[PDB]
Amino acid sequence: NTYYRVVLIGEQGVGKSTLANIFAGVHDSMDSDLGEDTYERTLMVDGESATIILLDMWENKGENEWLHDHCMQVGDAYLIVYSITDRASFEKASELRIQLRRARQTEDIPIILVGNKSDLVRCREVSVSEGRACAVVFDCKFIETSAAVQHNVKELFEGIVRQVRLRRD
């Protein structure tokens, strides 16, 4: 089907739920078109409609299943989120990315490293240029977002759709 399934991973506190909720928006209850930690919404990209399923399950079992079961949730793209104001979370993200590489199934799947909370300039602990450096060295795409100020949130999800489309030929 024409669904774009995006899996959100990263340390607790980095803003995965906020970013999902901010991209999802508040939905019109009359829309007939999905339970635990799941966001679904259509979005027009480059002229063609895309149905994005966002899976935010890492805190409820996703992380433990990675550790104990050695299994990652199936997606068309993975979003590895850290907070620009938290260096430990950034190192987790890099660790997660390296570990994901070893799921050889994910070879031709878009992985995006996301530095969230770019609105917190004064608390910044990770530079833009080292987020980028990590992306280049560990073979990701890279973006900085703010879910609070809603910066690069649409651009993130349009970019995921274009990458996923580039794959399917």
Ligand X SMILES: Nc1nc2c(ncn2[C@@H]2O[C@H](COP(=O)(O)OP(=O)(O)O)[C@@H](O)[C@H]2O)c(=O)[nH]1
* Residues that constitute the known binding site: 10-17, 116-119
Catalogue the E-assigned strands of 12-156. Answer: 38-45, 48-55, 77-83, 111-116, 141-144
- The residue number with the shortest CB distance to ligand X is 15
Sheet with 77-83, edge to edge strand ranges: 38-45, 48-55, 3-9, 77-83, 111-116, 141-144
**Interaction between residue 13 and ligand X (CB under 6 A):** yes
CB of 159: closest distance to ligand X in angstroms?
17
Window 127 to 146, contacts with ligand X (CB under 6 A): 146
**Interaction between residue 103 and ligand X (CB under 6 A):** no
CA atoms of 167 and 69, how far apart (whole Å): 28
Residue 36 and residue 105 in contact, taking contact as beta carbons nearer than 8 Å: no
CA atoms of 126 and 63, how far apart (whole Å): 23
Q: Binding ligand X by CB under 6 A: which of 148, 154, 159, 165? A: 148
Binding residues for GTP: 10-17, 116-119
Nearer to ligand X, 100 or 152 (CB): 152
The residues of the shown chain that bind ligand X, judged by CB under 6 A, are: 12-18, 59, 116-117, 119-120, 146-148
